[PDB]
Design a binder for this molecule. Structure first.
Ligand code: YUT
Ligand code: ANP
Ligand code: MG
Ligand code: MG
Ligand code: MG
Ligand code: MG
Ligand code: MG
Length: 318
């Protein structure tokens, strides 16, 4: 028989152009059959009725029932490319940062402000006009305020008085805009946040995309922290700039991939002060609109599957 690679995600991801491009290429492997789980099945059918697979590629995004995916993996015991239990942790920036620190990965100096919602004024925050103190730790402006939920993209940057004060409010992009200036200079007073030092870059973010620990594609985009105007090409796509990772950065990618147990893993680097700092780990993400990436990513994933499962199946492989 064929080795079955099962794809288990929300339809917005399963049916995305990058996913379809990569699955068509994985299907070219002679002994691999791809099965994409229907969203109606994922949401509405018990996991005992989900299709069988030998290798499971499954990842959380908004609205995905991760509990069911975990239960499926437990029931069927496939080879899992992206660890499902770790995807609970990736949803919490506190957990992400904890893992990065444990791996000796450079990240912005940060502090966690946990607020009890039934008692929002009893947390360890002191605010001045040009700084905050969080659990005693001082962050001079500029500083960054991130919701503890990694799925909440309402990240705020607070500007110093010397720069005219106010804040930059980021959000999941809406057409031409990724952020907007606000005259508000005071921090949010409900919710839990990470406060972190603002890392001075050249105005670009480096977005890194792993396919296993020994392959990483990187590209740069304009930082939303800049003015918030999205640069789009003639085709409506956000403008990307070329990046080659240095030796330190390839090691970061190796570490992130393995630490989060996410074969396919997106994360963000800030090139600042002669170093590279990780500020976000997103988990499963494909590069968009690169044919070379689609070719490479499919080859690596197919090869991983064959290396793992060819012997069980009595299939020749090197
Ligand atoms: O799951 P991913 O494929 O990683 O997609 C994540 C990002 O990708 P990346 O984080 O930049 O690599 C998408 O932005 P790009 O397509 O990269 O611009 C997002 O694409 P969008 O910003 O919609 C778009 F396609 F770029 P536009 O329609 O503005 O051209 C995608 O956001 P949506 O939710 O709105 O689809 C996001 O997913 P999520 O919001 O679930 O985090
Ligand atoms: N400490 C920091 N110093 C400077 N810029 C920062 C810092 N943290 C975040 N940023 C900027 O703010 C952007 C958004 O922060 P990030 O932590 O990636 O948020 P997110 O909501 O997880 N976005 P996404 O990549 O879509 O999941 C980054 O891409 C940087 O441009
Ligand atoms: Mg095939
Ligand atoms: Mg995601
Ligand atoms: Mg969108
Ligand atoms: Mg990010
Ligand atoms: Mg993120």
């Amino acid at each position: 028989r064929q080795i079955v690679v099962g794809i288990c995600s929300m339809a917005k991801k399963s049916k995305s152009k990058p996913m379809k491009e990569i699955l068509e290429r994985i299907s070219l492997f002679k002994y691999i059959t791809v099965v994409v789980f229907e969203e109606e099945v994922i949401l509405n059918e018990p996991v005992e009725n989900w299709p069988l697979c030998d290798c499971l590629i499954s990842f959380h995004s908004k609205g995905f029932p991760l509990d069911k995916a975990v239960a499926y993996a437990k029931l069927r015991n496939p080879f899992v490319i992206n660890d499902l239990n770790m995807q609970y942790l990736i949803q919490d920036r506190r957990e992400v940062y904890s893992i990065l620190q444990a791996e000796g990965i450079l990240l912005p100096r940060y502090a966690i402000l946990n607020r009890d919602p039934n008692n929002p004024k009893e947390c360890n925050l002191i605010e001045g006009e040009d700084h905050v103190e969080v659990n005693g730790e001082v962050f001079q402006k500029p500083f960054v305020e991130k919701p503890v939920s990694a799925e909440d993209h309402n990240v705020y940057i607070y500007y110093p008085t010397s720069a005219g004060g106010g804040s930059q409010r980021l959000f999941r992009k809406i057409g031409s805009r990724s952020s907007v200036y606000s005259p508000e200079s005071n921090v949010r007073k409900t919710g839990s946040y990470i406060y972190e030092e603002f890392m001075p870059t050249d105005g670009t973010d480096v977005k890194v995309y792993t396919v296993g620990p020994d392959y990483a594609h990187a590209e740069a985009r304009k930082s939303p922290a800049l003015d918030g105007k999205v640069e789009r090409d003639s085709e409506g796509k956000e403008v990307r700039y070329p990046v080659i990772l240095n030796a330190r950065e390839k090691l970061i990618a190796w570490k992130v991939c393995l630490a989060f147990k996410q074969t396919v893993c997106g994360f963000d680097l800030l090139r600042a002060n002669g170093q590279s700092y990780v500020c976000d780990v997103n988990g499963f993400s494909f590069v968009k609109n690169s044919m070379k990436y689609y070719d490479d990513c499919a080859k690596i994933l197919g090869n991983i599957v064959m290396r793992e499962l060819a012997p069980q199946f009595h299939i020749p492989w090197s």
